[PDB]
């Protein structure tokens, strides 16, 4: 600990893959960055104009952000299309988030209601789907065109990935169905969480984790590596454990987000965890909040390592699973890289990270150096994750249920 006091830890073999550059020609970077297609897509929907998407693209640097979010280079044309649509979805999802953060309760209520009804309308036309203008028809009754455009764009992504995995014979039918349901349920649960943000609780530092995980749609970002690597079937043979690791990664990303955004001019507002701690249970602000966050992040890394290196030892002879788990690890570690270099958070008044590389001789020591508050945090997070009250949320974030979230955080 010194004045660069965001010191985290990650195994050397995990982080040596982020020291890596994208070996790829410029034909294939413009195949993947189909900027003209993004323009035509956002002006075929009612979202925004060319200037807005170009500004979002300059801000987010969505390509290098994507290379922090997938580790598998496209191996066929379908993978190229998947990466293209994922890039587009990321870029415009952030623009939708910039606007929905100041939505009244009624406006969000209508938005999430329309998503929930449209999902169930277009889930019975499977494998067929309506086009963008055909999908505006059921949303014509809305009083805000932005909600209509957002819903059409999200369901467009949801149907496009399905169309891609059914235009090839590699992924089985019935698991593509579960994948589609998983994606749309994630989006609907995000709307439900931002709608639950209309109340301020009737507080506890575990409800906080449960909400802050759902406040971001990071699961959809983890699914990019699944799709682009062709592991949809082997991730559907292991929907559990994979979903838990992705939840741990979401918690990781949101801890880092809440710590970066509390050092900005923009009011954090929301249920920023540092704010909640400093209201009650923190002495000096930044130095102690940073150490709490570092403990939580290190504990998430250790639990992820142990879980992966157990599920591989108890499921031997499954190389596809191994590569999938390594991809999830890559995407969980990539959030450090993203917050440090590729997002427009070049504050440097923000904590300067010290990413320590845990070598092999140190790995047994480091996995037994678990005597911290982050241990309790992550353990209790895993318990409330596998709580039977929250079984419906689990099954909805798996591809095996309908999305319902409002009866478990508002009650």
Author numbering: -5 to 196, 198 to 406
Quote the study on this structure:
To address these issues, we conducted genome mining of terpene synthases from the sea whip coral Paramuricea clavata, resulting in the discovery of a biflorane synthase PcTS1. To fill the research gaps of the mechanism and structure in marine biflorane biosynthesis, we performed genome mining and biochemical characterization of sea whip coral–derived TSs, leading to the discovery of one biflorane TS, PcTS1, using GGPP as the substrate. Isotopic labeling studies, together with calculations, elucidate a cascade of 1,10-cyclization, 1,3-hydride shift, 1,6-cyclization, 1,2-hydride shift, 2,6-cyclization, cyclopropane ring opening, and deprotonation by the generated pyrophosphate, forming the biflorane scaffold. Our work demonstrated the mechanism of marine biflorane formation, elucidated the second crystal structure of a coral terpene synthase, and realized the terpene skeleton expansion.
The structural basis of the cyclization mechanism was studied by determining the crystal structure of PcTS1. Followed by several failure crystallization efforts with full-length PcTS1, we expressed and purified a truncated form of PcTS1, PcTS1ΔN1–5, which lacks the first five N-terminal amino acids with catalytic activity unaffected. However, it distinguishes itself with the absence of one helix (K), the elongation of two helices (H and M), and the presence of an additional helix (O) because of an insertion. Notably, PcTS1 shares a remarkable structural resemblance with microbial TS-like proteins, in concert with the similarities observed in ErTC-2 (15). PcTS1 exhibits an overall structure that closely aligns with the tFold-generated model of PcTS1, with a root-mean-square deviation of 0.94 Å for the Cα atoms. However, the tFold-based model of PcTS1 features two additional helices (K and P) and helix M in the apo form of PcTS1 is split into two helices (M and M1), underscoring the significance of protein crystal structure analysis for achieving more precise outcomes. (D) Amino acid residues of the conservative region in apo-PcTS1, DDXXE motif on helix D, NSD/DTE motif on helix H, and RY motif on the loop region near helix J. In the QM/MM calculation, the A+ is observed to bind within a hydrophobic active pocket comprising aromatic residues (F64, F93, F221, W335, and H339), hydrophobic residues (I59, A189, G216, V218, I254, V343, and P344), and polar residues (C253 and S338). Notably, R212, D215, and S270 were identified as critical for activity.
